[PDB]
Design a protein around this ligand. Structure first.
Ligand SMILES: CC(C)CCC[C@@H](C)[C@H]1CC[C@H]2[C@@H]3CC=C4C[C@@H](O)CC[C@]4(C)[C@H]3CC[C@]12C
Ligand SMILES: CC(C)CCC[C@@H](C)[C@H]1CC[C@H]2[C@@H]3CC=C4C[C@@H](O)CC[C@]4(C)[C@H]3CC[C@]12C
Ligand SMILES: CC(C)CCC[C@@H](C)[C@H]1CC[C@H]2[C@@H]3CC=C4C[C@@H](O)CC[C@]4(C)[C@H]3CC[C@]12C
Ligand SMILES: CN(C)C(=O)N[C@H]1CC[C@H](CCN2CCN(c3cccc(Cl)c3Cl)CC2)CC1
Ligand SMILES: CCCCCCCC/C=C\CCCCCCCC(=O)OC[C@H](O)CO
Ligand SMILES: CCCCCCCC/C=C\CCCCCCCC(=O)OC[C@H](O)CO
Ligand SMILES: [Mg+2]
Length: 355
């Protein structure tokens, strides 16, 4: 008689339906066809595959008191799917953080589907000791007729190698991305005063000194931020001949090109900080929900002697569902914090699929 299967059946269908909707939204709606959204589909494939393959077998074992109810050579395989799909999500979340960072030092699907194939192959490579050695020796994958990783080298080596190369690189490249977008906003409303200051200088002017210097100083300050470089140069010639009343009126026709360009760049940055913050929640929820399973699984190995493994085991059976639930919640994040995903999901529920 088990309570727990009534709970766990919820988490599986949330996982399956939501991650299908994310897969559906990137496949269909054109305003999601960018490289960072191509990763989020691949992530959702992993979360949906976790929900189809790994999670109902976990529920099944809950209904046999953890005494493993299937063929023995499926235990080593099930473990490989359970580790792969998670190792897939951590190298996904690392890649997005890293790819958006290299995007800031810069001015395609084949961009993305090489990088996704690069990440999946580093997951398939890293998880591959499990069935190659587990299918040889049933005592890497079974303890006491319960299917679970029973090799501590695979846990210790896998956890740090598979989760601390990527987490480190993800938490550095997330932090540096925040600092790159803070310097860009700082550097742009620096150029605001420099251009704006100099406008008030050219409108006050007496002579061709105050106009030619203050368009020289406008031009280099324009060069830090395309088309307005010519429009300063189209007005830099008027002051050089001495046409001062003409260059002053040409500059209030620069004021409109300036206000138009600054706001567009400024909207783009405020977008990309809202977008950096959405991932940061996808990133934050992943660690925090796996955090109790992770720490306890490592302490299983560290205090084999000094601790009640019945209690340690009774928590791992509980803590692994906290991290399963993480599959369910990536889609909810998008629903409340993207207009684009919410509008799309709200039309797939109305069975209406034409952009
Ligand atoms: C371990 C194996 C047997 C599990 C099964 C993996 C299956 C479900 C995976 C692997 C390859 C995946 C497909 C690869 C690429 C695409 C194209 C994309 O535009 C829509 C989804 C779609 C069609 C994927 C759907 C899910 C998929 C079919
Ligand atoms: C009763 C006698 C034999 C002693 C048993 C001590 C056991 C039950 C103790 C010692 C080590 C402990 C674990 C150490 C680390 C963590 C991770 C953290 O998120 C809190 C829970 C958890 C998982 C603890 C639960 C209780 C624990 C398993
Ligand atoms: C079962 C469990 C979850 C279900 C999905 C949940 C939501 C949608 C979106 C809808 O627009 C088309 C059907 C589709 C894709 C369902 C198909 C059947 C399904 C896969
Ligand atoms: C950022 N942080 C800290 C992390 O990502 N931590 C990680 C914690 C471990 C997660 C691995 C996923 N599997 C491992 C194997 N598990 C298992 C399988 C069969 C039987 C039994 Cl009993 C068990 Cl317990 C279930 C979960 C990935 C994330
Ligand atoms: C979108 C791009 C890729 C989807 C491929 C996603 C699926 C990941 C590769 C297929 C897979 O699930 O691999 C497990 C299998 O056991 C291997 O031997
Ligand atoms: C990437 C991993 C590649 C490995 C796949 C091996 C699959 C082995 C699974 C075999 C399960 C069936 C079995 O164990 O055999 C008992 C059966 O009832 C007959 O006697
Ligand atoms: Mg000033």
């Amino acid at each position: 008689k088990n309570w727990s299967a009534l709970l766990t059946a919820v988490v599986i269908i949330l996982t399956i339906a939501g991650n299908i909707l994310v897969i559906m939204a990137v496949s269909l709606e054109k305003k999601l066809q960018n490289a960072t959204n191509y990763f989020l589909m691949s992530l959702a494939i992993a979360d949906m595959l976790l929900g189809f393959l790994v999670m109902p077998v976990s529920m099944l074992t809950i209904l046999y008191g953890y005494r493993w109810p299937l063929p023995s050579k499926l235990c080593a395989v099930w473990i490989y799917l359970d580790v792969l799909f998670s190792t897939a999500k951590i190298w996904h979340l690392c890649a997005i953080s890293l790819d958006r960072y290299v995007a800031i030092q810069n001015p395609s699907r084949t961009k993305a589907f090489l990088k996704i194939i690069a990440v999946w192959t580093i997951s398939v490579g890293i998880s591959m000791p499990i069935p190659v050695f587990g299918l040889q020796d049933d005592s890497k994958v079974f303890k006491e007729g319960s299917c679970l990783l029973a090799d501590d080298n695979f846990v210790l080596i896998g956890s740090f190698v598979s989760f601390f190369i990527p987490l480190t690189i993800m938490v550095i490249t997330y932090f540096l991305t925040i600092k790159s977008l803070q310097k860009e906003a700082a550097d742009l409303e620096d150029n605001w005063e420099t251009l704006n200051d100099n406008l008030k200088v050219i409108e006050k002017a007496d002579n061709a000194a105050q106009v030619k210097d203050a368009l020289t100083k406008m031009r280099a300050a324009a060069l830090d931020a395309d088309i307005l470089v010519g429009q300063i140069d189209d007005a830099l010639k008027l002051a050089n001949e001495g046409k001062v009343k003409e260059a002053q009126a040409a500059a209030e026709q620069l004021k409109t090109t300036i206000n138009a360009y600054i706001q567009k760049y400024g909207q783009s940055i405020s977008n990309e900080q809202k977008a950096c913050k959405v991932l940061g929640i996808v990133f934050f929820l992943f660690v925090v929900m796996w955090c109790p399973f992770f720490i306890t699984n490592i302490m299983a190995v560290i205090c084999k002697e000094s601790c009640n493994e019945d209690v340690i085991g009774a928590l791992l059976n509980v803590f692994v569902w906290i991290g399963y639930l993480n599959s369910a919640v990536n889609p909810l994040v998008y629903t409340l914090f993207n207009k684009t995903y919410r509008s799309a999901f709200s039309r797939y529920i109305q069975c209406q699929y034409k952009e």
